[PDB]
Amino acid sequence: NIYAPLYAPFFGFAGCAAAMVLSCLGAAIGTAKSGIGIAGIGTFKPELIMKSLIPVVMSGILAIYGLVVAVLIAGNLSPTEDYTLFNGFMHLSCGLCVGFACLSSGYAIGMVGDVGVRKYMHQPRLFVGIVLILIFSEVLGLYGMIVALILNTRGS
Amino acid sequence: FSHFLYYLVLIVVIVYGLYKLFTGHGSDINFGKFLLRTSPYMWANLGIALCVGLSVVGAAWGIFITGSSMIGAGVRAPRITTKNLISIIFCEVVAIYGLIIAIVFSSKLTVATAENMYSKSNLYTGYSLFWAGITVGASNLICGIAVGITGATAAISDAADSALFVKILVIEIFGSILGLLGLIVGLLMAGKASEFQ
Amino acid sequence: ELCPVYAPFFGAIGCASAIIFTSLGAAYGTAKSGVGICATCVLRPDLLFKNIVPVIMAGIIAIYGLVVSVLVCYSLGQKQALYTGFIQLGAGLSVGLSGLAAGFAIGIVGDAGVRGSSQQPRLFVGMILILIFAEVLGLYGLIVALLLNSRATQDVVC
Amino acid sequence: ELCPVYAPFFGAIGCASAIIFTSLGAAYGTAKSGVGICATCVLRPDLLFKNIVPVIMAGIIAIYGLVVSVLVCYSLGQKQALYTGFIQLGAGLSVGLSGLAAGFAIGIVGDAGVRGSSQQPRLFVGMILILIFAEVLGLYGLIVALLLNSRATQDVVC
Amino acid sequence: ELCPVYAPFFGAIGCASAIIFTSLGAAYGTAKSGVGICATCVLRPDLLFKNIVPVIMAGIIAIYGLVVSVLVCYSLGQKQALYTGFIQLGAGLSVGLSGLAAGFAIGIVGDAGVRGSSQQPRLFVGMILILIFAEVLGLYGLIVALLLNSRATQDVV
Amino acid sequence: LCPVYAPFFGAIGCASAIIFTSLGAAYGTAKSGVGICATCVLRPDLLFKNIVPVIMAGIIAIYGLVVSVLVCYSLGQKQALYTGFIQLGAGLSVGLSGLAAGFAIGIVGDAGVRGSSQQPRLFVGMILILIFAEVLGLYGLIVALLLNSRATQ
Amino acid sequence: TELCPVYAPFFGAIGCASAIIFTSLGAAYGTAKSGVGICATCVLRPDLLFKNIVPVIMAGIIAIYGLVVSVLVCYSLGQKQALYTGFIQLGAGLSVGLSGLAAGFAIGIVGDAGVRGSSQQPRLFVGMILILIFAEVLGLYGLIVALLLNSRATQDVV
Amino acid sequence: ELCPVYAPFFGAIGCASAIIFTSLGAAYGTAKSGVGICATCVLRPDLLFKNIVPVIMAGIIAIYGLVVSVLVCYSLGQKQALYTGFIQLGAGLSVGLSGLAAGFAIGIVGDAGVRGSSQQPRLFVGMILILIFAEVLGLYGLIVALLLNSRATQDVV
Amino acid sequence: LCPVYAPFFGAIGCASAIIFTSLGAAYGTAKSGVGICATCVLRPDLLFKNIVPVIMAGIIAIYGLVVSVLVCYSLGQKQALYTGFIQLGAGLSVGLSGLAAGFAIGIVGDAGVRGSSQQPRLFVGMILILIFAEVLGLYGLIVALLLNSRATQDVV
Amino acid sequence: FNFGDVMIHQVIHTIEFCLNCISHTASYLRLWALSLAHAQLSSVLWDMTISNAFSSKNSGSPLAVMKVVFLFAMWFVLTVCILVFMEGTSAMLHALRLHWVEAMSK
Amino acid sequence: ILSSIWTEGLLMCLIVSALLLFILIVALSWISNLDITYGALEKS
Amino acid sequence: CCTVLSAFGVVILSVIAHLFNTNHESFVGSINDPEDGPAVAHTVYLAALVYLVFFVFCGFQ
Amino acid sequence: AGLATVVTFPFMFAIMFGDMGHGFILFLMALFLVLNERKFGAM
Amino acid sequence: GVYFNIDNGFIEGVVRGYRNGLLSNNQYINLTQCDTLEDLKLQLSSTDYGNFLSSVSSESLTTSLIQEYASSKLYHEFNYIRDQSSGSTRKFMDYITYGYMIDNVALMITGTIHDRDKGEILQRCHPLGWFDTLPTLSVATDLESLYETVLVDTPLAPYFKNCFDTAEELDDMNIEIIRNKLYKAYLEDFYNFVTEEIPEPAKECMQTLLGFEADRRSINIALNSLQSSDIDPDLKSDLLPNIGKLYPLATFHLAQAQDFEGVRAALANVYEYRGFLETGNLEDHFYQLEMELCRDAFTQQFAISTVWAWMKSKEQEVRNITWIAECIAQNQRERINNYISVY
């Protein structure tokens, strides 16, 4: 079969790896850079820490976004079934458009939710705006996951 | 000087690609035939070795990040130097993840017969072990660095007040989700891959 | 010969780029402006919801990337023309690397605008107008990619 | 041979470049001059709709890129000459990488002009004068790209 | 063989590169001189139209690219020789990367001369005299490309 | 099946197994020896108990030496690509692991021997941290000695 | 043919371009860096202005050295020229260009340092000219090398 | 096929790199730890002849390179196998890039140690003890290269 | 044995003989000129005594000029590839060693004319160090002349 | 008497002398270098200036004799400025360093 | 065949020896950035 | 300084004109050299007279 | 060493500076200073 | 924060430990309740100062000896942190001490104009701003023979770029000009060092802490020039630093500020310094804003600006303890709560 060559799972497992590595990279930037800002206010008003763990949770959801598409790419890969190069390019693209989506969303959550938590010890009215900017910066990875799911269902 | 080499390699790649494309021979730069004709044992052994290498270079990374600040923060408050070793432990488990995935991958590493050597399954299980070693080593790298950073902040917030370590251990938990998720994905990727036959 | 087997690669990376670079620009525009929002609403709490307009203005860039990437995704085919892959690659780059530019512009304008609008209340209208001039760049990229994507599969053959 | 299969690639990345490298110069001219408006109009807010002329002249070169991207887009085909792809790549680069220069010049001149026009109000007519020379650099690239694009499909065969 | 299919590539890259790098040089020469003007006449704004000479002399070396990127554009054909494409690429680079140097020199001499000409009134003649030597660089690049482009289709087959 | 370029990967694996491990051991010796020399100018009686980080860095280089010796006893002119790439993997594993473990022992060791002179309760702390960083070289040695056992089968 | 292929005037056009490009870069550095020193040491000593323009004349001679060899390589280009001709025209172009570039660096650095300190001591004017002569013979040597390479471009060619 | 023509290239690079990178390592070990001798023997020159031990232990690394370079040089041939060239490349790199590390460690430890040994004379024994662990790195590289070079031409065809 | 692309290496050897020696001489002239024009403001009597590093820099460019002329007068269309390789080696031997000699002459000349105004006895030491720095380019001249004497010796 | 101040000095003297016996017989080749440079520059200045002024056409014309006058003036000022003053000074200084190093060290 | 010069074996020796040389350049840039705390060694 | 250049212009150009007149092979003897000797000597000797006019005029200064 | 210099320094000069035209110019502009050494000494 | 703990892991965690010894508001209220300097010593002995005045024993204990020893242990802690520093960190520690070297130069060359003895004008010098040729500034009077003899080998040598010595030797009027101009060039150089080589989290929060030093020094120069100076604005503008938040528009109006209203209307256009010149003690306004800028520099973790934010906070702690011990020894308690505590 000229449409299903034997090197096609290379681009599917590359889609798995780009969906997992870059999304957990974004999740790790988003949890580490924000945990810096949460622990920075550890002494000055310690009672605002357990309320401020939201940019850590919203960063950890970005790894679930990559986990779902990595499971759904790895479920379409078998050495006995035929696997087109179209399918491999499509899995490469759907991992690649969720990995950098969650990477950018994790950079945005990490840069927002430590400055916000670090200024939140002065003004207690910041929290609604902080959560709102975190929602706007966390739907960035949801957009990429939507594109990845539509692209996975299209390419198979 | 490194930017000069990054520009020079880019210029040589563009000149070689446009020379190969203009002369009607542009299909000679053939990445698919490169994937078909290189040995699957390269990809398999390279994936195993980079799995156990890049898990350890993230584990050891996090160990010095939350070790040097633990020892610095323990000078005035030496009552952290044993309780807070769980931040070393959380960034050390990402190496045992890569180790127990590298051994499970090396169980799928036998001698394939030369008549069916570049077959469908043998090449599949080279590609799968390569990228499932990469996605575990890189995930444990990034998880070890993130747990080291969030343990280095915890080692100083512990020495500030004792009730803060319980509150900032949760960030280390959410940071150590990542290596376990890479542990899951690298086992799902090489789940249907057979041995070399 | 005219619809080769490697032809959906260009359409696939064009569908990828319209999310990658657009979400990178939108993330810059949300992050750098949210730093200014969280830095100026310490002593100005009542301006907390007037200052979200840079962040919303940067989220519309990612919506622009989302629309063009979905509309490219619903034209990828297995037996696809190489012309169609080239057009989808061009339409993906035209949204991505222009939404990155508009996100850089909104991220650099919006934090200075929310830092000056907390000090001067009449600077808010000027901030909104400069952000419209900054968002229209990504709007131009979306216009180019929607006029371009409509030409993929018009007179394709073989 | 004279109209190969890879021939629309250069036309597609010339349609894409004429908005990419144009909008990422227009974004510099918007951002670098908008941080000079938002930092100056905190004390002189009556000059807000007068200092915004660098942002407008940075938005004009993006329209210069948009026109050439549309005119290169509507001359793309599956079976077009490789000469047409080379000409469209040349037109796209001529608009993009010269509108990038015009945007750099507008961005560097504009914030220096609006920070100085509030100390001396007779520097505004000098800012407009320098900024017309900085803005005609993209109009020259538009002239070159339109004279290329008029030559694209004139006497093409095969 | 003498006129291949890929031959208009070098001519199109030359026609683009003729105006691209002169726009970069003119942008540098306009940008630094405009910062120098806008920082030198917030105190003495009487020298506003006097100090416009570096911006004009930086804008001339973009017209130097606009001339050759039209004269190369009106010699681009589908079936043109590879010699013609090589000369048009050499002409585009000869105007472009020389007007870029001329724009660097005009942009440095321009703000260094307008920040000092607000103090000494007769540094203006010296500023013009140095900017003439900085603008004949782009004039030399124009001469080289106009001598190339008069040979790109002279005795071609 | 057994090409002419196949003992390149085994010879370069035997090379890298001692090269990267000695780079890591040299960083762990030098950076933690700066801390020993800086600490023991004001409190010199801690000189021979602060010597543990350079000993652990030496154990790392011994772990790399073991893999290099055990790879170079399986090299031949006519070995397969299987043996060649499995020796390459056995070299890369202990190379990256000894390099990482030596960097970690070097960065933890000087901070530990500096905190041990100010607070005496940090000696047990630096030893218990350095033992976690020591066994990462063991974690690469395990994969190296497992890939060695599958050399000629 | 074989001695005279089709891609042979490429090296000749690059040798005709580089001889003026790199000498224009060198002459531009020698003009700008040594004109900063003229414009800085004239606000206190304006009477030595027409004599401190020695390092910009000596730098503009480097551009004339590039212009002469660019004209002479331009009038030796042919379509069916030898590959040896294109090779040593590239050699002549590089010999003028990358040596006139170095001569321009030396003239710029020495002329800046000389007109900076010649306003303080009037006896340094005869010294900086004697150093700029040694800085300008560096480009004169490349001129000699290219004029000897250009006398062999079409001498015994077949 | 087993003994190609390009096969002495890797052997000559292995003969070169064994002395090149050990000379780099010994040069850093002599340089960095000789700056410390020249800085700390302007005040106490009585201990000039005992601070020389980092320089000597650095210069042992160059002898480690010299031995492997001579033993690879006297096994080169025109018609040697490609296996022999690969083993000689590996034995050259195993001494060179490991003695480079040993020389880095000897230079850093020696410069940190001869500066601290003039303020505390008891630190000299600790400096010698750390430099032994720094010099056995190059000794281990020597062991690996000798075990390769014994295997180089053993059962070659 | 005598191919068509053979005078490319000879043209690069003719270029690189003067290019890198001019770069070295230009570094030496620039560093020494900054030294002279900062040490002869207060001591103008020893101006013409300090021009010796600039002369030592110019002799490096003369060394490059001689090798480039001798390589230029041995070029040809139908020459061997051995001749082109020897001319490339003879160009690089004088060029990248005169570059180093020019670096040494510039650094030593700057440091010697900035301190020779304070101590008048340092001039005969500066001349002695610049002799060792100029013999570094004389060595590349000797290697280039001995290479170019064998570029066409037994050539078919 | 210090044996360390005599043995080290004689080792340095031996290394220096045995180095310089090779290093000066190759440093006297500047007598060929600068002679080649002077001869070739005086050749290629003649060939560019007055080899152009020699022509059997327009014999006795005013333009063809002002050509010779201007090219002789351009030749003579270039010979005096370069090939005498700014070339023989370099030859003078090189014959000077051949005395200061290659002769006044034996 | 893949190529005659850039064969299947040369091109995957130049990937192994590029990965190893990348790790070498990274590790040498780590050891090159290693500086000594001189203030804890002087008398002052 | 014009009288020195003019005296050398008398002497050198007179010797060159005499060597063109007598068909000396260092000036005529090559193919690239001019063909007619006295035709070049007639225009070099007039330049020698022009420099003699400059030498006499600047000799009374 | 300045008693063997009196011949060898002009001769090692002349080996590098070998030309009867430039040499006669340099000899002439030296003999101009030798014959006029009384007017230039008290100056 | 990924490459920080290589050379700065131990350095930060000890400085973060030194931060926890900053006295809180309750530990200041417990000091304001004291009745005797001995009771204040015993109250400080329960903090992290514990037994620093142990070699005094209740008889020679004055309110200046507390300021001596409490600052001396600050200086020894700074030297311990500096001795473990290497590379860019050690250079950053040196650039902090350069500003104290400038004050010791300007205090050493005023003790020779007044002919006060060299052994007693050096015990008033600052211990962190020590260079080896600091006592040898008592050798000359004019600026040129103190630069060209002593101050060339010092690291203060690039900072003498605009000090124009017109061969007038020294009065007290131009030593303050030399001091302000050295501090101006130093603030320029250290801002360019922070912008150039210091990493990004410790860059933005150190440029603000250093631009505040520049703004405070600009306001103090432009306000002390009213009473004891009659200078031209073209010569006054060479004393104002150009790195701060206040430079391009407001230091121009501070240069031609001939009256107090010329300063007040110039500082009314800047947003965070308006209201300082209206009510209250201005020095307390600057010290309060300094502590509010040093408080939110500890809240960013992997930053070398924590050293600056620690030592300025610990200097304010020594100033607050000195003010309290001055209040409880002279029996004035009307303004004992005038300390500044953000920790």
UniProtKB/Swiss-Prot annotation, chain A:
GO terms for biological process: endosomal lumen acidification; Golgi lumen acidification; proton transmembrane transport; vacuolar acidification. Proton-conducting pore forming subunit of the V0 complex of vacuolar(H+)-ATPase (V-ATPase), a multisubunit enzyme composed of a peripheral complex (V1) that hydrolyzes ATP and a membrane integral complex (V0) that translocates protons. V-ATPase is responsible for acidifying and maintaining the pH of intracellular compartments. The record marks 138 as: Essential for proton translocation. It is found in: Vacuole membrane. It comes from Saccharomyces cerevisiae (strain ATCC 204508 / S288c) (Baker's yeast). Residues 74-91, 152-156 are vacuolar. It comes from the Eukaryota. Keywords: Hydrogen ion transport, Ion transport, Membrane, Transmembrane, Transmembrane helix, Transport, Vacuole. GO terms for molecular function: proton-transporting ATPase activity, rotational mechanism. Residues 31-52, 114-125 are cytoplasmic. Its main location: membrane. InterPro entries: ATPase_proteolipid_c-like_dom, ATPase_proteolipid_csu, ATPase_proteolipid_su_C_euk, F/V-ATP_Csub_sf. It is a multi-pass membrane protein. The gene is VMA11. The chain crosses the membrane at residues 8-30, 53-73, 92-113, 126-151. One of its GO terms (cellular component) is vacuolar proton-transporting V-type ATPase, V0 domain. This is V-type proton ATPase subunit c'. Belongs to the V-ATPase proteolipid subunit family. Present with 538 molecules/cell in log phase SD medium.
UniProtKB/Swiss-Prot annotation, chain F:
The keyword Ion transport applies. The keyword Nucleotidyltransferase does not apply. Residues 29-50, 110-121 are cytoplasmic. InterPro entries: ATPase_proteolipid_c-like_dom, ATPase_proteolipid_csu, ATPase_proteolipid_su_C_euk, F/V-ATP_Csub_sf. Residues 1-5, 72-87, 148-153 are vacuolar. The record marks 134 as: Essential for proton translocation. It is found in: Vacuole membrane. The chain crosses the membrane at residues 6-28, 51-71, 88-109, 122-147. Keywords: Hydrogen ion transport, Ion transport, Membrane, Transmembrane, Transmembrane helix, Transport, Vacuole. It is a multi-pass membrane protein. GO terms for cellular component: fungal-type vacuole membrane; Golgi membrane; membrane; proton-transporting V-type ATPase complex; vacuolar proton-transporting V-type ATPase complex; vacuolar proton-transporting V-type ATPase, V0 domain. GO terms for biological process: endocytosis; endosomal lumen acidification; Golgi lumen acidification; intracellular copper ion homeostasis; intracellular iron ion homeostasis; protein targeting to vacuole; proton transmembrane transport; vacuolar acidification. Its main location: membrane. GO terms for molecular function: proton transmembrane transporter activity; proton-transporting ATPase activity, rotational mechanism. It comes from the Eukaryota. CDD domains: ATP-synt_Vo_c_ATP6C_rpt1, ATP-synt_Vo_c_ATP6C_rpt2. Present with 8450 molecules/cell in log phase SD medium. Belongs to the V-ATPase proteolipid subunit family. This is V-type proton ATPase subunit c. It comes from Saccharomyces cerevisiae (strain ATCC 204508 / S288c) (Baker's yeast). The gene is VMA3.
Curated annotation (Swiss-Prot), chain L:
The keyword Ribonucleoprotein does not apply. Disulfide bonds: none annotated. The chain crosses the membrane at residues 1-20, 44-61. The keyword Endoplasmic reticulum applies. The chain holds residues 12 to 72 of 85 of the full protein. This is V-type proton ATPase subunit f. It is found in: Endoplasmic reticulum membrane; Vacuole membrane. It comes from the Eukaryota. GO terms for molecular function: proton-transporting ATPase activity, rotational mechanism; RNA endonuclease activity. Residues 21-43 are cytoplasmic. It comes from Saccharomyces cerevisiae (strain ATCC 204508 / S288c). V-ATPase is a heteromultimeric enzyme composed of a peripheral catalytic V1 complex (components A to H) attached to an integral membrane V0 proton pore complex (components: a, c, c', c'', d, e, f and VOA1). One of its GO terms (cellular component) is vacuolar proton-transporting V-type ATPase complex. Accessory component of the V0 complex of vacuolar(H+)-ATPase (V-ATPase), a multisubunit enzyme composed of a peripheral complex (V1) that hydrolyzes ATP and a membrane integral complex (V0) that translocates protons. V-ATPase is responsible for acidifying and maintaining the pH of intracellular compartments. Keywords: Endoplasmic reticulum, Membrane, Transmembrane, Transmembrane helix, Vacuole. It is a multi-pass membrane protein. GO terms for biological process: endosomal lumen acidification; Golgi lumen acidification; proton transmembrane transport; vacuolar acidification.
From Swiss-Prot, chain M:
The chain holds residues 453 to 495 of 890 of the full protein. Glycosylated. It is found in: Endosome membrane; Golgi apparatus membrane. It comes from the Eukaryota. Residues 18-19 are vacuolar. Present with 1084 molecules/cell in log phase SD medium. Belongs to the V-ATPase 116 kDa subunit family. This is V-type proton ATPase subunit a, Golgi isoform.
